[PDB]
From a paper:
Staphylococcus aureus FakB1 is a prototypical bacterial FA transfer protein that binds palmitate within a narrow, buried tunnel. This study focuses on FakB1, an FA transfer protein from S. aureus that binds palmitic acid (16:0) before presenting it to FakA for phosphorylation and exchange with the membrane. The open conformation arises from a conformational change in the dynamic region that rotates helix α8 outward to uncover the FA-binding tunnel and reorganizes the adjacent α8-β9 loop into a new amphipathic helix.
We identified two alanine residues (121 and 158) in the tunnel and mutated them to bulkier residues to partially occlude the FA-binding pocket and push the FA out of its pocket to destabilize the fully closed FakB1 conformation. The 2.35 Å crystal structure of the FakB1(A121I, A158L) double mutant was also determined, and superposition of the FakB1(A121I) and FakB1(A121I, A158L) structures shows that they are basically identical with an RMSD = 0.241 Å.
Residue numbers in the entry: 1 to 288
């Protein structure tokens, strides 16, 4: 038995872990109305993408990995000699990448494809990849791995702050007067992941109080977990994410694993400039 673990680009794992464990990546894409297409990888400049998103009158569209990259990746893993492939995808409720990976897993002969719906995104999704790899190293069975990941999904979440009301207007989700009143009142919508769906939670004035609410809610949730791993997922606003990270380091005991990360173009295209998330998992994920 030879078990491998792969994922998509929305897991936003650092290139270090991808090189160390040789994790395969099915990249997503983001295309603008001008024809400019960005394929998610650790080589493109996120600053250029943010500058484009600012210099674009219309919001871009996002694209799941085409029903092809999964096929070649499974084929290469089978040619290398792998009996089982555990695939970790972003939330199937927000994207079709999980469905495309599952469908591609049916057209590849010679290896079992275990597609997993992480119901999350970013490093919170990459935590499933890290746990799967760790438990392959421990000598677990793919069914036991899927069971463990499903149990982990029960104690895993992500809260989010949207800062770009102009981006929400550019997508048509809000009106002009709404955006103006939100800017005047410093209104910052707070959202959360629930069963793979992004649902509203609070509407907090100013980004500072919204960050405090993020911390309060996540700490209240993880107080009951035997193991806690927190993740700051920042955007182009370095100061906000760094402040939240340092506040967590000061407020949380060392028994908590606090980490920092940043999301890429596919997430930024829908979150806008200044978005910031706090995610949690109820396990001690091996981040090295
Ligand atoms: C850590 C930040 C989380 C914010 C995530 C916001 C993105 C919502 C949906 C993701 C992109 C849409 C679907 C991906 C590509 C596609 O299938 O079209």
């Amino acid at each position: 038995m030879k078990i491998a673990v792969m994922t998509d680009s929305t897991s936003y794992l650092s290139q270090d872990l991808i090189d160390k464990y040789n994790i395969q990546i099915a990249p997503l894409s983001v295309t603008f109305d001008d024809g400019k297409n960005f394929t998610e990888s650790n080589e493109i400049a996120i600053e250029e993408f943010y500058n484009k998103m600012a210099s674009s009158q219309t919001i871009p569209t996002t694209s799941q990995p085409a029903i092809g990259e999964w096929i070649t990746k499974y084929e290469m893993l089978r040619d290398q000699g792998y009996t089982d492939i555990i695939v970790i995808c972003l939330s199937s409720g927000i994207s079709g990448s999980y469905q495309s990976s599952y469908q591609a897993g049916e057209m590849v002969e010679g290896v079992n494809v275990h597609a997993f719906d992480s119901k999350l995104i970013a490093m919170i999704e990459g935590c499933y990849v890290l746990r799967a790899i760790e438990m392959v190293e421990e000598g677990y069975e793919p069914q036991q791995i899927i069971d463990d990941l499903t149990n982990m999904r029960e104690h895993t979440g992500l809260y989010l702050i949207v800062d770009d009301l102009k981006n929400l207007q550019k997508s048509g989700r809000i009106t002009g007067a709404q955006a103006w009143v939100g800017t005047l009142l410093k209104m910052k919508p707070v959202l959360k992941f629930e069963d793979g769906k992004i649902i509203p939670e609070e509407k907090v004035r100013t980004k500072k109080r919204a960050i405090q609410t993020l911390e309060k809610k996540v700490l209240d949730i993880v107080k009951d977990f035997e193991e806690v791993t927190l993740f700051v997922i920042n955007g182009d606003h370095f100061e906000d994410g760094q402040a939240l990270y340092k506040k967590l380091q000061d407020d949380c005991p060392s028994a908590y694993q606090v980490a920092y990360s940043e999301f890429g173009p596919v997430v930024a295209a829908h979150l806008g400039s200044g978005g910031l998330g706090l995610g949690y998992v109820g396990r001690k994920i091996r981040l090295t």
